[PDB]
């Protein structure tokens, strides 16, 4: 009746400055008409993207990131890291029979006025010179590794605002820390965190927002 494809404006995004190439997405809003236009229309389109296009490599084909926009300016914006989550492929590719599963979850308040709920995940591989089929734990081992993983993870929180925590998570040094801390228990398997989520955006803070570009 009106053919609505010619009633929107082609936009672009800008990731934070603590990553590689940022011009990674482009979307639509509305024409610059009246009655509350694109300048104040969306103001909150959450967007998904994997880490391959954000790091330049491809080994990060999992652990996709969800980003949130808040402020718009000069036909541009700047987004804050909202969270991340694994690809569904790797989960059911990793999980297999005749082994164990270990998990944990903690909700913490960082140094600054943010909160975050973090998850964990791990398995138990059989080492060399082994003939068993299962390689299971003893139920006290799981209780010990659970609390030590919880506390050694919380030690990274209470300090390191989420800005620097993003660059601490990108190289995955915390997994090597977990390995070094818990090698006394098992021969370990691929340790991951698999989920961060937030539920208390404390305030705007346009200063720290605009501090991530240039």
């Amino acid at each position: 009746v009106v053919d609505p494809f010619t009633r929107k404006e082609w936009f672009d995004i800008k990731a934070p400055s603590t990553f590689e190439n940022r011009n990674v997405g482009k979307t639509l809003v509305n024409k610059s008409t009246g009655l509350k236009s694109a300048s104040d229309a969306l103001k909150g389109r959450v967007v998904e993207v994997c880490l391959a296009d954000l790091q330049g490599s491809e080994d990060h084909s999992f652990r996709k990131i969800k980003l949130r926009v808040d402020e718009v300016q000069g036909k541009n914006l700047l987004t804050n890291f909202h969270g991340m989550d694994f690809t569904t492929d790797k989960l059911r590719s990793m999980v297999r029979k005749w082994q164990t599963l270990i998990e944990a979850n903690v909700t913490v308040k960082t140094s600054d006025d943010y909160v975050l709920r973090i998850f964990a995940i791990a398995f138990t591989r059989k080492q060399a010179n082994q003939v068993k089929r299962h390689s299971y734990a003893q139920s006290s081992h799981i209780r010990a590794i659970r609390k030590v993983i919880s506390e050694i993870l919380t030690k990274e929180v209470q300090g390191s605002t989420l800005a620097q925590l993003t660059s601490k998570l990108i190289p995955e040094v915390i997994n090597k820390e977990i390995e070094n801390a818990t090698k006394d228990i098992f021969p370990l398997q691929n340790i991951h965190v698999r989920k961060v989520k937030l539920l208390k955006q404390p305030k705007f803070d346009v200063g720290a927002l605009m501090a991530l570009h240039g």
Binding site: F5, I13, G25, K26, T27, V46, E48, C50, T88, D89
Partner: protein, 127 residues
Amino acid sequence: SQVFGVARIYASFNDTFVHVTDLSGKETIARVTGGMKVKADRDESSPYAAMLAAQDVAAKCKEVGITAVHVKIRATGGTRTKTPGPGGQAALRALARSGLRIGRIEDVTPVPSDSTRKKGGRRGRRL
């Protein structure tokens, strides 16, 4: 310089439909189902009709001028079949055949934990 969209395919039983959208997913663009292209009420899930509708969807998308797409397949999901439909492959086939770049494939059929007792009763749906 490639502009990205998101397919977000829903491939359930007895029909199938798609709609391209922005990377955020706030503005769906060009939604087409089997009913848009065939009226018989049985072959709504036919992969032939699925491809016939995907061709028109790709044409309407190229009219706006979109290049790359992220395909995200989803079956009926939940406490149901947990299996994509028959047209789930012919959709991708026709979409890639109709001049459009594909990248970053993934499934998003949401696996649930055990809850919400499925229908059919204890004895289940019997013929």
